[PDB]
């Protein structure tokens, strides 16, 4: 790695920084608050009796989450189709309005409940928009909505002046004028009543048996977003930098125990350098400090490929109690060298007064010596007078000019 | 860290960063040169002596008092009361920005300062030009007085007065340094500038630099990678332009610090390790001697100055 | 009347925590040492109070003489008007499509004739008895700050804690106070029902977009704020 | 200019020009910093050449460590090498020293050097080379009594 | 002026400039340090007496 970072093959004697030591996260938690005011979908899927088609009901559930677990309502669905959205990705998307419409129709009439359909129901009773974004759930209800004598409580429109608009509701029971005269509002020849009955019986065929249908219309408009919360996750893992996703605040680090008392309505926390150092757990009210995941710099202290190849590995600015003689210094910690207790001359500096060299054998580590020791005898009646002279030479090299370049 | 500062824990950002060029191996090559240069400025002024000298046990130099400049054996950290007062006035791993500690700690610099003090007190100026020669301190003061033109008799006769004046000056220098809290302004300004330059880089990371957000985990989760490449490119450009100017300012400040350290080493060599004939290079007035004192990020020179006073009118021919 | 709000009208700008630091933010705050309207002698007219940038509602009401507040567009027919009515042990927050009278009083239960409400939002009941409130409308969220502090406005410092948020977006330009007394007057037109009760004063002060520098202590409570366009030292 | 058409390849050329200009600006800045450093070093070297080669200086470690005598310059492809000749004392010896000498009730102080003593004897010598000389009036001066 | 040199009399440009970071308060902090330094060089040579 030293030869790679230096782009050479014969590295000299000294210390060289090559890479950086970074601990990778092991797991990854989400923690977002408890799942609370659940919507009531069973109130429309598990209703004692559904409404007619000409008077189909429309329920708006609001600020009520959106847990799409419709499977438990008679899982063997006869028709579970989705328009504009896929089946399961539905459960993890937000929307403004979650309008839910319900009504009862025949088994062979369920095909009319879909975008771009023609017939009696689709045109005169219930019309869906062309670009409808939602789901259509239909299930058999023979046992519930059928009697041996015929259930004539469900009515449907058979005649109308024009086709209904998307999501249009018409309760009008006026006599449909099929002839030329208005009939003065009386049922007779060429003047038929618009609504007709069903008369579901248990002996009817699958095509004529009653089918309870419900539509999930999803609107997303300029307003807030208060539904879609089936969000849930793992337990707190303390003392081990993981990936946390606390209530949208995402990061990587260690969540340690705190002693700073926050405000009751306060959840997040930042330092002076705009760094998240504390977050409140949504499940249980408790503050956890985000400490940065252990990091520093790895450096090779090589004596040079000329002598040998035994090198030492120094992690700077990190205590190596976590992830070859281990020794902790004040500038880091080095592995591969032995702490020798006799001070010699510094050759390869490390930091905080520690130097390394080759004893000749293995890399050593010692406190650098500032020089020799000499204590002169200071007396008020003694002096040191020189006798001989020495003519020495001192070499001082100094640069003057540079290389004149142009671009 | 060129990789972590620009690209937070993102492998695609790391793959995109290598296409910009060799800036990642140059911005870290210049900063390590700055560090190795800073590890040399603290050796041209404090490590001028070869052998460490020590103070004799008898604390009688001839009448003078050097207790405030000599190390105190009571305090575990071997320093002087002046150095202890100076150390208690300089007010000093978050993201890919680390602070490397210096090689020579505050204990070895103190030992070098004590050795220089012992050499300039017991030996005089010979400890900086060859073998150390023992000489009484009053005779060294007579030497330094004759070097500027004043005869040695005024010192050999009025020795008690000079000693009392020097002791009073040494005692009053502590109150003078403690009176003005902005006396160590040159040592706090550099620390404040370094802290500001180190804290302004994290404050600019929150800026979107043109993108929709500032964190990579949001851009890599709201938009698809095939259409989110220009946002990461703009973010990398903005985070590299903020680091290039930081490295440039660091180089300018390192050159300034190197010039200041060269000047300080010249002053230490020409004022502490001997007497100079310059006017205001070793203090305002007639320079006699200089005592060094260490400080967490600098050196304080105490220059002893002989000033004439109580002049009188006379006739000259 | 007209008085000065020296060092009051501050709140928490965002749901973030800090520890003994300084945070400068350009928000919608009440300017310090401003000219607020002290309506203490108006014992039921002039309900024309705008809601351009919000309202700073300060009061020293003795005990339960206030019944709630109303924030509407124009108080006409088929106009979204939110009514926050505070009962003894519960508050009701419904928005109605109804034409409100001059001073709808509560002692009564039905304010107008043709009321038509459509929202559902129930919360904890809200109502030296200073009751500080700050109302605003941003990002489709009718945002309120409430504080109950003991003692007029003193020279102390007390932040306004965000209590309840509710999503609605409308052209809120209405504000009026609902009092409570003994003499029952069902007549909506007659705006004269003065009864011998405690001191009643509804403070009105409009907010302004300003840059505020707040100091967060070790516990995360705003204890100081210096403004930025009122004094050169600030 | 060959894979994509000119009218829509303008942003790529713009980004390339920006990247190639930002890489040259920092190079020019580093060159300016290095040129300032080289200018400071050359000013220091010229001062040393003028104060050490073209004469003798009384500075301690400006013309070499020790006592500077002379300096010889030598050229180099990108610099100058100064060879400083230094006189260093050695083979020192212990002696007895005294400030002055009281004789005839007068305190006599040495003119140059210090009063050296090696046992029941006293001589006058300089402060850089041991040269024992008898205490005469030529190398000594009176400055009052020995009180 | 970091605001006027980059953005000429435009409030939207001023709102967009604050998103770049704290360069506006650093480029003016360095230039005023240059000025205070220049106000000191003329006092170490001429104001020695
Ligand atoms: C979640 O449920 C737990 C256990 O009942 C309760 O202690 C806690 O207060 C709840 N938290 C929220 C946010 O509702
Ligand atoms: C290797 O060591 C030899 C013997 O000491 C020495 O002569 C030579 O210069 C060294 N070479 C390198 C590349 O350090
Ligand atoms: C470094 O490691 C030691 C040994 O375990 C331990 O006391 C602590 O984790 C660290 N020491 C300090 C004070 O940094
Ligand atoms: C050095 O010797 C001292 C005194 O015995 C001892 O305390 C210290 O741990 C030794 N250091 C090593 C392990 O070299
Ligand atoms: C020197 O000064 C210190 C501080 O005033 C004092 O404590 C000490 O006794 C003095 N020593 C002498 C030699 O007078
Ligand atoms: C010398 O005499 C002149 C003229 O009277 C006077 O101005 C000056 O102050 C005197 N100086 C001293 C030192 O007495
Ligand atoms: C406050 O308003 C009143 C009435 O407009 C006016 O008389 C008074 O001078 C104003 N005071 C301030 C603080 O400007
Ligand atoms: C109104 O307050 C009375 C008295 O406490 C209480 O009995 C009644 O239930 C309250 N009505 C609500 C729920 O607002
Ligand atoms: C002089 O004597 C002292 C004390 O014995 C001794 O320490 C010193 O080294 C001697 N010096 C010489 C030059 O003989
Ligand atoms: C010291 O040296 C001088 C000159 O050689 C000589 O006269 C004297 O006798 C010597 N004294 C002793 C006791 O060594």
Author numbering:
A (entry chain C): 298 to 620, 640 to 676, 690 to 736
B (entry chain B): 737 to 828, 854 to 1078
C (entry chain B): 27 to 70, 80 to 142, 157 to 176, 187 to 210, 215 to 297
D (entry chain C): 981 to 1127
E (entry chain A): 737 to 785
What does the paper say about this structure?
The trimeric spike protein is a major membrane surface glycoprotein of SARS-CoV-2 that mediates the binding to the host receptor ACE2 and subsequent viral entry into cells. The matured spike protein contains two subunits: an ACE2-binding S1 subunit and a membrane-fusion S2 subunit. Extensive structures of the spike trimer reveal the open and closed conformations for the three RBDs within the spike trimer, where the open “up” RBD conformation is prerequisite for ACE2 binding. Upon ACE2 binding, the spike trimer undergoes conformational changes to expose the FP motif of the S2 subunit to initiate membrane fusion that allows the release of the viral genome into host cells.
